[PDB]
Design a protein around this ligand. Structure first.
Ligand SMILES: O=c1ccn([C@@H]2O[C@H](COP(=O)(O)OP(=O)(O)O)[C@@H](O)[C@H]2O)c(=O)[nH]1
Ligand SMILES: [Mn+2]
Length: 277
């Protein structure tokens, strides 16, 4: 029975958002997050913004086997216990997901603990949004007073038009393709390294982000996979109750980057070190 698989899967232990953040800070750890799309890719499917690629799938599988330590926190969706935190559509989505991949989760995810993939998703799927302010405040402490290198796609525009990164000392951006970034992986890694001197690296780049963080970490850098944090922050700032489309940039869960009306932001443009693609 699926019910019995649900119970068995609750053996997986995830540190929820605030606990994950305490871990990252205490340890100055890199962070890689596995979401539903990564599992889809690893098992042979194409996902929003990234076509199936066998080399990518293999790297993702290797990275998932890495133990979490003071250098790197490996994260999973925080859905194996206390699912009642999430709204009905999210609960259904996630249970369907881990039931489909029960064999994957039961067999490949045997570490003593994982961080939360939802460090990038601190608002919209929660029934009780009261803790979200605290979540975002804790997140911001990661980059307060830091020089940042943000590696993201052309539509991501993380922090653009909002105050998410206002307390960062400086921002440089490596702007990559908004879809199929893995095709340019070697160049992305090469230019990230070149520009990372004395910077904290934040990556918003789908499955490619996980490989980048893994490789940067092996080279001794702290790099944090932050995914869709910008969409969540925008929804939080407007007090959104549902996933509303942003007009000026990519929006999480809108899976084709359609209908985007781009603006010219001099400040954003001046932050761009190079474009890849
Ligand atoms: O080839 C790609 C794949 C995705 N992204 C960006 O990656 C971010 C989302 O990353 P992820 O899937 O890790 O987000 P999560 O939902 O797990 O927070 C968004 O800004 C996308 O625009 C990108 O720019 N290029
Ligand atoms: Mn996602």
């Amino acid at each position: 029975s699926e019910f019995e698989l649900m119970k068995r899967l609750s053996e997986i232990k995830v540190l929820p958002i605030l606990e994950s953040l305490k871990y990252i800070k205490h340890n100055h750890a890199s962070v890689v997050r596995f979401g539903d799309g990564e599992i889809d890719l690893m098992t042979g499917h194409s996902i929003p913004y990234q076509d199936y690629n066998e080399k990518l799938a293999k790297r993702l599988q290797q990275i998932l086997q890495t133990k979490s330590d003071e250098k790197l926190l490996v994260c999973l969706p925080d859905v194996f216990s206390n699912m009642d935190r999430y709204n009905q559509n999210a609960r259904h989505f996630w249970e369907r997901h881990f039931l489909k991949y029960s064999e994957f989760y039961l067999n490949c995810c045997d570490a003593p603990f994982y961080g939360s993939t939802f460090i990038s998703r601190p608002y919209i799927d929660l029934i009780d949004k009261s803790p979200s302010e605290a979540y975002f405040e804790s997140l911001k402490e990661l980059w307060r007073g830091k020089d940042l290198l943000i590696v993201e796609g052309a539509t991501s525009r993380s922090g653009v038009g909002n105050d998410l990164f206002v307390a960062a000392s400086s921002i440089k951006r490596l702007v990559c393709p908004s879809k199929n970034a893995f095709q340019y992986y070697d160049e992305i890694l090469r230019l990230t390294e070149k520009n990372a001197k004395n910077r904290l690296i934040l990556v918003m780049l789908g499955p490619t982000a996980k490989v980048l963080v893994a490789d940067l970490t092996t080279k001794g850098y702290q790099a944090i996979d932050l995914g869709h944090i910008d969409s969540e922050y925008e929804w939080y700032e407007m007090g959104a109750t549902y996933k509303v489309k942003l007009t000026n940039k990519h929006t999480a869960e809108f899976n084709y980057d359609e209908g985007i009306e781009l603006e010219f932001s001099q400040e954003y443009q001046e932050q761009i070190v190079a474009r890849i693609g």
